[PDB]
């Protein structure tokens, strides 16, 4: 059976290797912007996607578009927000039924950018990416992992929501640009299964079997997956500190 071989999962790990940003575009490509400025704009887009109740994939997909454009073209400090508003404009078209309007995104910039400037930046961003907009999202791997876990649907919704929160926090952090979406999704799942330390996990599939299963389908050592889970839970501690 295909459930024993999983030809779908292998095709997903092959597609993840094309829409991949660079690790060192801050040192090699960008002159004006610094990793502190990427966290700033990323924090803004996350608040926009949360206020507009966007689909769960929109903000991480936009960050994928942003890191990929910054790996190709030097962007001025004053135009980083325009690039960020444009990445949400394209991602919303790829993942939402009624996407965000160009006029609403300009409002979210305090009317710093103009609608046609966003439409012209759309043509630039899509052409620079050579229309490679159907990137693999961590949500893709999360839904595939949950389909292999023998858990109750009520337990799966909490895991899915907690991991989606972890995925969003990873997109705002620079330390996770080098991680492929499969690694981000796998670490988000095992971190979510531990239940935010509010409860001793009672899962039908043990965490030991879960981590070792996830490590052998995404092709990594279990200790590498544990270090990714630790970096995610460290991100959760630092995120909560900002209050």
């Amino acid at each position: 059976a295909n459930l024993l071989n999983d030809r779908v999962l292998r095709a997903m790990l092959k597609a993840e290797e094309t829409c991949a940003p660079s690790v060192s575009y801050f040192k090699c490509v960008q002159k004006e912007v610094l990793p502190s400025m990427r966290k700033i704009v990323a924090t803004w887009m996350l608040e926009v996607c949360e206020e507009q109740k966007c689909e769960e994939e929109v903000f991480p997909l936009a960050m994928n578009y942003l890191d990929r454009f910054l790996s190709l073209e030097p962007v001025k400090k004053s135009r980083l927000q325009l690039l960020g508003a444009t990445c949400m404009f394209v991602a919303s078209k790829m993942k939402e039924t009624i996407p965000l309007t160009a006029e609403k995104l300009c409002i979210y910039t305090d009317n710093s950018i103009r609608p046609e400037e966003l439409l012209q930046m759309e043509l630039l961003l899509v052409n620079k990416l050579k229309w490679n907009l159907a990137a693999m999202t961590p949500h893709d791997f999360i839904e595939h992992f949950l389909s292999k876990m023998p858990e109750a649907e009520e337990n799966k919704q909490i895991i899915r929501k907690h991991a989606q929160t972890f995925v969003a926090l990873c997109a705002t952090d620079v330390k996770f640009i080098s991680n492929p979406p499969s690694m981000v999704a796998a670490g988000s799942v095992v971190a979510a299964v531990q239940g935010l330390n509010l409860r001793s996990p009672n899962n039908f599939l043990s965490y030991y079997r879960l981590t070792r299963f996830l490590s052998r389908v995404i092709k990594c050592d279990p200790d590498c997956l544990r270090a990714c889970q630790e970096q995610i839970e460290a991100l959760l501690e630092s995120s909560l500190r900002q209050a």
């Binding site: 790829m94 043509l123 052409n127 490679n132």
Partner: protein, 259 residues
């Protein structure tokens, strides 16, 4: 627009599409279908036409798709066949490439929806390459399509069977007037299906066809073998949920290359 063509040391085709533009940049359908076409070339499948580049040019916008071109389609290949017809092993080789490329599209949630020998394209080296996807002849449409019912990827497997029988015949299997006549032209062979195998919310009730019985399969394709006849039935099954899949057809013993 107008189609162009070039050679180096291979061949390249052209395609220009003007999209509305104005309201909110590029249309939703434009960015999604072109990106999905871009997603398939990451795998580089030998049985699917290779999209080479995508160029948008701006009021007005016109994005031009640059595809890989071949001259010969399947019908030209079939008309150019030897007078006795194609050898069995040659047909099994084309059927393998056909199902390989079709399973590649189905794995990426792409239904061809319109498979005919004018769409299947064959290179000069014998490589089958599917085309015209993700962008009247009723003879290859599945019964769930002719009934205007809920249709999915098994609609391509019905078209595969019609072309499977056509390579041994060089004459189409079912040729009908309208959708009502084509469905009547489908029940010559598989008989009239029972009650609950018929869906509802259809266009034609079951009582629109006389009670018929399934005829033997080698009455329409005798030059095939018996094992190939049971594979044709699994492709030409009325119920789309019993219809054989593209991947399952590749595991059939008839299309297993010997040695």
């Amino acid at each position: 627009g107008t189609v162009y063509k070039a050679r180096d040391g291979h061949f390249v085709a052209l395609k220009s599409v003007r999209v509305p533009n104005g309201e909110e940049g590029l249309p939703i359908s434009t960015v999604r279908e072109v990106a999905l076409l871009r997603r398939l070339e990451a795998f580089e499948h030998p049985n699917v036409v290779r999209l080479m580049d995508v160029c948008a040019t701006s009021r007005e916008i016109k994005v031009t798709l640059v595809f890989e071109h071949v001259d010969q389609d399947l019908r030209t290949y079939l008309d150019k066949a030897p007078p006795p017809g194609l050898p069995a092993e040659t047909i099994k080789d084309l059927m393998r490439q056909f199902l390989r490329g079709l399973d590649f599209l189905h794995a990426n949630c792409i239904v061809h929806r319109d498979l005919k020998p004018e769409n299947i394209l064959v290179t000069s080296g014998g490589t089958v390459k599917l085309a015209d996807f993700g962008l009247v002849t009723l003879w290859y449409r599945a019964p769930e399509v002719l009934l205007q019912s809920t249709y999915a990827t098994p609609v391509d497997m019905w078209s595969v069977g019609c072309i499977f029988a056509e390579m041994f015949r060089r004459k189409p299997l079912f040729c009908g007037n309208s959708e009502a006549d084509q469905l009547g032209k489908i029940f010559d062979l598989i008989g009239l299906p029972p009650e609950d195998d018929w869906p509802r919310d259809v266009s034609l009730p079951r009582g629109a066809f006389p009670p018929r019985g399934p005829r033997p399969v080698q009455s329409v394709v005798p030059e095939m073998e018996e094992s190939g006849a049971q594979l044709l039935l699994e492709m030409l099954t009325f119920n789309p949920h019993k219809r054989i899949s593209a991947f399952r057809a590749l595991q059939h013993s008839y299309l297993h290359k010997d040695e």
